[PDB]
Design a protein around this ligand. Structure first.
Ligand SMILES: OC[C@H]1O[C@@H](O[C@@H]2[C@@H](O)[C@H](O[C@@H]3[C@@H](O)[C@H](O[C@@H]4[C@@H](O)[C@@H](O)O[C@H](CO)[C@H]4O)O[C@H](CO)[C@H]3O)O[C@H](CO)[C@H]2O)[C@H](O)[C@@H](O)[C@@H]1O
Ligand SMILES: [Ca+2]
Length: 231
């Protein structure tokens, strides 16, 4: 059976296991994103994390939002990782629930690996699950699947199950994507390391594009909980 090993239910504020990013990072967090991250864009309302993206000017940027992470506090090798999320749907939006290898501080991205548990862009009627890594030839690799979601603005449950064989992705318990990491096949060795969790909402960038609905602000992403189970 699955054993619960960590959670944030956001019932009494935001856990001290989260650290917040500030600013636009290096070339828009590597994706030419337009937002400046802050602590102030994260609040709790009635047992939910609220990440609010705003049209707000600071440090030469015209949008603000939150990127938070458990890096340096909590990380896991294998498990079931899930969040119950309701996210906005508007041109320019790019919310994510994802994971990075603990060793990013030494080896960088994408050698560290990334598991995107949920991404959404713009007004798409689907959500994406992806791994990113450096394959056996040291070439940047990604492997993505998607599932139709007619209402991303409603709460859905976004899950991975991760073991030494496979990562499986689910929305509302519906399996839609799977990736073998057995024996480090296709150079997937770095998914046999500890990973930490991130939550964010980016505004613009290479994938969603730079057509921003300025009339969609402020915009809210609500997270009822994040949980990690292991065997
Ligand atoms: O040298 C070859 C090319 O390098 C390019 O610069 C790299 C930069 O893009 C890269 O930025 C990544 C960023 O893309 C990545 O985005 C995340 C996604 O991959 C996915 O996991 O989803 C999350 C959530 O939506 C998303 O943020 O995030 C990582 C971690 O923040 C970030 O590092 O970083 C590398 C390593 O530094 C840069 O080399 C450059 O722009 C190209 O011109 C060049 O061809
Ligand atoms: Ca909650």
């Amino acid at each position: 059976n699955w054993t619960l090993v960590w959670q944030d239910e956001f019932t009494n504020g935001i856990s001290s296991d989260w650290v917040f990013e500030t600013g636009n990072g290096n070339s828009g967090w590597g994706n030419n994103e337009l937002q400046y991250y802050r602590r102030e864009n994260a609040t709790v309302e009635n047992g939910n994390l609220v990440i609010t993206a705003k049209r707000e000017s600071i440090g030469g940027y015209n949008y603000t939002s939150t990127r938070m992470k458990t890096q340096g506090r909590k990380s896991w090798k294998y498990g079931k990782v899930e969040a119950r999320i309701a996210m906005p749907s508007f041109m320019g939006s790019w919310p994510a629930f994802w994971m990075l290898g603990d060793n990013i501080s030494s080896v960088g991205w994408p050698a560290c690996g990334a598991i995107d548990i949920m991404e959404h862009v713009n007004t798409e009627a689907q959500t994406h699950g992806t791994i990113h890594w450096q394959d056996h030839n040291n070439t940047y690799a990604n492997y993505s699947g998607s599932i139709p979601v007619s209402s991303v603005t409603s709460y859905h449950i976004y899950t991975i199950e991760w073991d030494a064989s496979v990562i499986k992705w689910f929305v509302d318990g519906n399996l839609y994507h799977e990736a073998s990491i057995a024996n480090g096949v296709n150079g997937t060795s770095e998914f046999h390391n500890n990973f930490f969790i991130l939550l964010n909402m980016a505004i613009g960038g290479n994938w969603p594009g730079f057509n921003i609905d300025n009339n969609a602000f402020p915009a809210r992403m609500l997270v009822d909980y994040v949980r990690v189970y292991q065997k």
